[PDB]
Design a protein around this ligand. Structure first.
Ligand SMILES: OC[C@H]1O[C@@](CO)(OC[C@H]2O[C@@](CO)(OC[C@H]3O[C@@](CO)(OC[C@H]4O[C@@](CO)(OC[C@H]5O[C@@](CO)(OC[C@H]6O[C@](O)(CO)[C@@H](O)[C@@H]6O)[C@@H](O)[C@@H]5O)[C@@H](O)[C@@H]4O)[C@@H](O)[C@@H]3O)[C@@H](O)[C@@H]2O)[C@@H](O)[C@@H]1O
Ligand SMILES: OC[C@H]1O[C@@](CO)(OC[C@H]2O[C@@](CO)(OC[C@H]3O[C@@](CO)(OC[C@H]4O[C@@](CO)(OC[C@H]5O[C@@](CO)(OC[C@H]6O[C@](O)(CO)[C@@H](O)[C@@H]6O)[C@@H](O)[C@@H]5O)[C@@H](O)[C@@H]4O)[C@@H](O)[C@@H]3O)[C@@H](O)[C@@H]2O)[C@@H](O)[C@@H]1O
Ligand SMILES: [Br-]
Ligand SMILES: [Br-]
Ligand SMILES: [Br-]
Ligand SMILES: [Br-]
Ligand SMILES: [Br-]
Ligand SMILES: [Br-]
Ligand SMILES: [Ca+2]
Length: 440
């Protein structure tokens, strides 16, 4: 055949088959394992009575550290009725700084009223059916600036990175959401750098096996420049999905001998098409000072052949280096030895915000969680929260799968600590914090 191998990095970093195949052995080390949690201590968020509360994010200062909003910490979370998976709205919870109990989290309610997306006179928001995850920054002039994912069940799962300013009143006692403003779509994918939903739709959408994503926008600043880093998929010009992508050695790793081995297995494997379709990416755009789209930038990293889904993009500068993280499910990967119970947080390090990134702990493995989904202390959506001092970050996550238990809802997991040193990380032994704790 005249279809020959090649190597093209497209100028971006890559999560490779070589590195992923080392994780099943490496993940046996307790250094990379989410700690065992004691279910006897776990409570529902009492101020969110009856709602599942899952993927969540703190209001952050520009540097990623947790914001002090007039004496409060603020966390945005997705929540809704456990009996309806399509009930997904963003709620704002808060706690006085210094409190750490689960029962210190108060609930200011939903950020958005039903009419907000229609009052915005933004044509994409008119079609929103769910509010998916994001980030929130506390601006120089004291404003709460939210980014999140507008999901549209009406348009085959379209996902649009979206922003609003949340106007909140204080009261000694409680915080109040008075309304939102500057509510607008920012980016729905350009087709060339980031897949757009029209490519999903026209290739056959749900019956194609493709997984289109454009979500989880994370706000970050470098030198006054404003950016979103987000979960996406590559487009036509930066290593698109398809049979051809199986012939790019940059997706396999450094050795040509590993490449010919692994590629022939993959090409004749039951997971060939899944790997062809797999083209996840952590994308990056620059914003203008009014939070509109200024510049589409190339992905920080891509996961061609390995998975279509690298979620909850997170990036921050810590002690001189940039750390980039993403969550990913073993159930959607194509890597032998990685099982449908494996769940990971993967992590990468660079001297600059824009790359290039190198895998942490050699493989990119940072955290592994492999509890049965029915386990009450199952956790997902791990998220590294930068701290003002030291080498440790706080890992938040949600606990208990949505809708599984009548009386134990998805809740804030016990936080725990992750030590980050140069290119290596370690779960800090016996570092379990309160449920939902953001700071040490
Ligand atoms: O309180 C939450 C509760 O309300 C629902 C809406 O029923 O969620 C509304 C909440 O969701 C948010 C999030 O941003 O706004 C969603 C916005 O999008 C719309 C639609 O434009 O809602 C979509 C959700 O509603 C559902 C079903 O309730 O679909 C409506 C949608 O489905 C279609 C297609 O089949 O129709 C039909 C179905 O409905 C009946 O008429 C029953 O009444 C049947 O005859 C018929 O079989 C389509 O015609 C129609 O447009 C659901 O699939 C979607 O997720 C907005 O109305 C809404 O603002 C919140 O802002 C908002 O509070 C619900 O999901 C949830 O349980
Ligand atoms: O909660 C969001 C939050 O979670 C994070 C992680 O923290 O990750 C995403 C998480 O969400 C999951 C699943 O819950 O993965 C998402 C991926 O699954 C897809 C589909 O593969 O989306 C699911 C949503 O789309 C909906 C429908 O709008 O379901 C699609 C689903 O329904 C089927 C039938 O079951 O078809 C329905 C569809 O078919 C038609 O009839 C044809 O027209 C339509 O009328 C109708 O809409 C099925 O064929 C199809 O698979 C919605 O109900 C579902 O919720 C992907 O689009 C999506 O990428 C987790 O696995 C994952 O961790 C974070 O990233 C995020 O912010
Ligand atoms: Br409302
Ligand atoms: Br929906
Ligand atoms: Br195309
Ligand atoms: Br192709
Ligand atoms: Br193809
Ligand atoms: Br129960
Ligand atoms: Ca894909």
């Amino acid at each position: 055949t005249n279809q020959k191998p090649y190597k093209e990095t497209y100028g971006i970093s890559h999560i490779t088959r070589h590195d992923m195949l080392q994780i099943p052995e490496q993940q046996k080390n307790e250094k990379y394992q989410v700690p065992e949690f004691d279910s006897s201590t776990i409570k529902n968020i009492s101020s969110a009575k009856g709602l599942d509360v899952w993927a969540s994010w703190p209001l952050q200062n520009a540097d990623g550290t947790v914001a002090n909003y007039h004496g409060y910490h603020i966390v945005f979370a997705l929540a809704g009725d456990p009996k309806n998976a399509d009930d997904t709205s963003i709620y704002m919870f808060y706690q006085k700084v210094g409190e750490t109990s689960i029962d210190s989290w108060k609930n200011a309610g939903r950020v958005f009223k039903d009419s907000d997306k229609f009052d915005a006179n933004d044509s994409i928001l008119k079609d929103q059916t769910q509010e998916w995850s994001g980030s929130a920054t506390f601006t120089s002039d004291g404003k709460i600036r939210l980014f999140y994912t507008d999901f549209s069940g009406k348009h085959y799962g379209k996902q649009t990175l979206t922003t609003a300013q949340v106007n909140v009143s204080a009261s000694d006692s409680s915080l109040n959401i008075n309304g939102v403003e500057d509510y607008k779509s920012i980016f729905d994918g350009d087709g060339k750098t980031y897949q757009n939903v029209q490519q999903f739709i026209d290739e056959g959408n749900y019956s194609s096996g493709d997984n289109h994503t454009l979500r989880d926008p994370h706000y970050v600043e470098d030198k006054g420049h404003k950016y979103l880093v987000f979960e996406a998929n590559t487009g036509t010009e930066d290593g698109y999905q398809g049979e051809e992508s199986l012939f790019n050695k940059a997706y396999y790793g450094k050795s040509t001998s590993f490449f010919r081995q692994e590629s022939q297995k993959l090409l004749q494997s039951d997971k060939k098409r899944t790997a062809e379709l797999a083209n996840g990416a952590l994308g990056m755009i620059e914003l203008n000072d009014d939070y509109t789209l200024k510049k589409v930038m190339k992905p920080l990293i891509a996961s061609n052949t390995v998975t279509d889904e690298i979620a909850r993009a997170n990036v921050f500068k810590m002690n001189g280096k940039w750390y980039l993280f993403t969550d990913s499910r073993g159930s959607k990967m194509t890597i032998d030895g990685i099982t449908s119970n494996d769940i990971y947080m993967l992590g990468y390090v660079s001297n600059s915000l824009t790359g290039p990134y190198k895998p942490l702990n050699k493989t990119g493995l940072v955290l592994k969680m492999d509890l049965d989904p029915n386990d009450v202390t199952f956790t997902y959506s791990h998220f590294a929260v930068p701290q003002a001092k030291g080498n440790n970050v706080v890992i938040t996550s949600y606990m208990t799968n949505r809708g599984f238990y009548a009386d134990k809802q998805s809740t804030f997991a016990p936080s725990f600590l992750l030590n980050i040193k140069g290119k290596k990380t370690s779960v800090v032994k016996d570092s379990i914090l309160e449920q939902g704790q953001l700071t040490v």
